[PDB]
Structure 1
Amino acid sequence: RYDSLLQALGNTPLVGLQRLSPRWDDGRDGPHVRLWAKLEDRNPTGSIKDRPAVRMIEQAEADGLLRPGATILEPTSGNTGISLAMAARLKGYRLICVMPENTSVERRQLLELYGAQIIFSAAEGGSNTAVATAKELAATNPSWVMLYQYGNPANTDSHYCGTGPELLADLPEITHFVAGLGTTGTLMGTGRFLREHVANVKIVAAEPRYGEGVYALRNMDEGFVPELYDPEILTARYSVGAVDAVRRTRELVHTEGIFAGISTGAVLHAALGVGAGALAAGERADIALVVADAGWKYLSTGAYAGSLDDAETAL
């Protein structure tokens, strides 16, 4: 029972993938290699971004940085914008998202529906300019505040305090944690928590390939490195092709009934490579991986529909 939708977030299920796992059962050919999917679409707006959105706002509040009716300014499109829009609306704040004018429409659709306003910054300026614009705009008014998910430790804290502890509790035998590398909040926070608490644990990134746009799934330009990022937290980072990400996304729903967004496809590709390695090594693995959101908002890319080739060109 929750007085507010804000509280109905986190404590997400960890689900075993009995069919997609390289080897679910221990046996004569060697120990189990299991995949466990953490379902972060079970959240207020359907993504993992509800965690850092809410914590960034509450931390801003505890720090005395917000006041009643304040306007939040964030250089984002996509899930974080949705998450902040919901949260801002429920706490009496306004939200303005800043994003490049050439940002994919699928990363925009629901924003005005949840109450947000959009500033469009110069397409050629890219990420760099959208961030600098939100930074400038925030300085116009004491009422206007930029949370900046790429550098706000409350992003990382949501995972250190939420995603991590839940994974420890549900999967004390964890050998690997795999997730997408975007703001880096999920891997930095969950990774730092698990590394402190689990002996020998590996932390593995998935990310897009350099040179592939996959625009409907990307918030930032290839070169940009979030200030949250700490290259010492990761054990490995793997680039995943669009064809492979889409293939795995279709595989997950077809085989395990879990309808996920495309980044989950990339994560699963990474987790399966990690898994094939343990299997060829004769080693036990229990690999937890993050389902960041559901496939719903990505249908209009055609990616779930026809051939893998067209899906690639659509991306």
Structure 2
Amino acid sequence: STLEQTIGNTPLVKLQRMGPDNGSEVWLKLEGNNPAGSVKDRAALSMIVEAEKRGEIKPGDVLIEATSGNTGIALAMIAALKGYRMKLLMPDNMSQERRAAMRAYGAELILVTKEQGMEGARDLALEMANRGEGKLLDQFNNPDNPYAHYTTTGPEIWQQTGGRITHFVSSMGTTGTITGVSRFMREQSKPVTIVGLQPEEGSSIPGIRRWPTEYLPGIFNASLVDEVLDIHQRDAENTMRELAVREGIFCGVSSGGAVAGALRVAKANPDAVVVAIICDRGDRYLSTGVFG
């Protein structure tokens, strides 16, 4: 008990109804149990704590990041908790719902133009960190992001399955989760297939993105992901709805996708123990209408 100690050690919960019934088990790592409601609390904690250890920041300082989803909420929370001033940059095209989740933790929101977009904010955010007016977290290139999953998430999944896990499935955003977990799994003796997932070409899945072969985050090791699968937006959205109704698991669209991918992996592997990451709870998705 200190909000920090409530980060991680999330439940791992078996699917009881969905999926093939061919010997294969599919377990869900409920990252929505994190204080601020997503897997991001892990990387936000790690990045900040490790920066503190390196003398880079002290409670009074300002932190900076370009983002507007779970990362923003996570950082804003950790900032509120440890006493930092968060500054989050994003395009001026957001629901008052997303903005309010970040604002509630006291984070200052710097809007950018619809036209400089997400790419603009990463650039502006970089400019400010030169200037000395705050520490940039740089979630796509900061080793401490995947170090959080190497250190905690992976060991937890390994401990919670007694080493029986055979496949791991993660929807890829920054890729910290899959990188960090794969890294850990490679250190074990028995093998573990690592399956990443991204949206189909046309698809839009709020946590994640289709990465072109050059723009890849600097954290990513392509050799740590055994296999990459595409997820149609519609299958992720259906699987998400289904999860709530048939399993009691109320999660976001990426998580729907992760279970969809995990199910495809189970259909193709009889005695598998697949572990999928459920990134967040469904709560912050309700106003977008994707339930219905």
What band does the TM-score fall into relative to the shorter chain?
A: over 0.9
In the alignment, which residue of structure 2 is the partner of 1:6?
A: 4
**In 1, Cα distance between the equivalents of 2:96 and 2:203?**
18
**In 1, Cα distance between the equivalents of 2:9 and 2:35?**
12
Matched, 1:191 2:189: no
Q: How far apart are 1:165 and its partner, in Å?
A: 0.3
SS of the aligned residue for 2:102 comes to coil
Q: How far apart are 1:130 and its partner, in Å?
A: 1.3
**In 2, Cα distance between the equivalents of 1:120 and 1:210?**
28
Q: How far apart are 1:103 and its partner, in Å?
A: 4.1
Match of 1:302 among 286, 289, 292: 289
Write the deviation string for residues 204-227 of structure 1: whole angstroms up to 9, x where unpaired: 11221223344xx14768544211
**In 1, Cα distance between the equivalents of 2:169 and 2:275?**
6
Match of 2:149 among 145, 154, 159: 159
Query: What letter corresponds to residue 164 of structure 1 in structure 2?
Result: G
- Over 3 Å counting, the alpha-carbon distance change for 1:130 and 1:201 in structure 2 is same
SS of the aligned residue for 1:123 comes to coil
**In 1, Cα distance between the equivalents of 2:105 and 2:28?**
28
Q: How far apart are 1:122 and its partner, in Å?
A: 3.0
The percent identity for this pair of structures is 42
Matched, 1:244 2:235: yes
CA contact (8 A) 2:27 2:274 kept: yes
CA contact (8 A) 1:50 1:84 kept: yes
CA contact (8 A) 2:200 2:210 kept: no
CA contact (8 A) 1:106 1:298 kept: no
Query: What letter corresponds to residue 168 of structure 1 in structure 2?
Result: W
**In 1, Cα distance between the equivalents of 2:147 and 2:201?**
28
- Over 3 Å counting, the alpha-carbon distance change for 1:43 and 1:198 in structure 2 is farther
CA contact (8 A) 1:73 1:95 kept: yes
**In 2, Cα distance between the equivalents of 1:293 and 1:218?**
9
In the alignment, which residue of structure 2 is the partner of 1:287?
A: 274
In the alignment, which residue of structure 1 is the partner of 2:166?
A: 175
Q: How far apart are 1:239 and its partner, in Å?
A: 1.5
The number of residues matched between the two structures is 289
Match of 1:67 among 44, 50, 58: 58
**In 2, Cα distance between the equivalents of 1:198 and 1:237?**
23
Matched, 1:234 2:225: yes
**In 1, Cα distance between the equivalents of 2:58 and 2:64?**
14
Query: What letter corresponds to residue 50 of structure 1 in structure 2?
Result: D
Matched, 1:93 2:88: no
Query: What letter corresponds to residue 161 of structure 1 in structure 2?
Result: T
Query: What letter corresponds to residue 282 of structure 2 in structure 1?
Result: G
Q: How far apart are 1:118 and its partner, in Å?
A: 1.1
- Over 3 Å counting, the alpha-carbon distance change for 1:9 and 1:256 in structure 2 is same
CA contact (8 A) 1:264 1:290 kept: yes
Write the deviation string for residues 46-77 of structure 1: whole angstroms up to 9, x where unpaired: 11111010110000100110033100000111
CA contact (8 A) 1:175 1:200 kept: yes
In the alignment, which residue of structure 2 is the partner of 1:27?
A: none
**In 2, Cα distance between the equivalents of 1:108 and 1:240?**
27
Q: How far apart are 1:195 and its partner, in Å?
A: 1.8
SS of the aligned residue for 1:289 comes to strand
CA contact (8 A) 1:22 1:34 kept: no
SS of the aligned residue for 1:110 comes to helix
Write the deviation string for residues 82-129 of structure 1: whole angstroms up to 9, x where unpaired: 111111112121000011223455432311111101112233333322
Match of 1:150 among 125, 136, 140: 140
**In 1, Cα distance between the equivalents of 2:123 and 2:210?**
14
- Over 3 Å counting, the alpha-carbon distance change for 1:239 and 1:124 in structure 2 is farther
Q: How far apart are 1:15 and its partner, in Å?
A: 0.7
Match of 1:136 among 121, 127, 133: 127
- Over 3 Å counting, the alpha-carbon distance change for 1:238 and 1:221 in structure 2 is closer
- TM-score, normalisation: structure 1: 0.87
4+ runs of 1 displaced by more than 3 Å? 103-107, 218-224
- Over 3 Å counting, the alpha-carbon distance change for 1:11 and 1:198 in structure 2 is farther
CA contact (8 A) 1:127 1:221 kept: no
CA contact (8 A) 1:76 1:219 kept: no
CA contact (8 A) 1:206 1:237 kept: yes
Quote the RMSD (CA, aligned, Å): 1.7
Q: How far apart are 1:150 and its partner, in Å?
A: 0.5
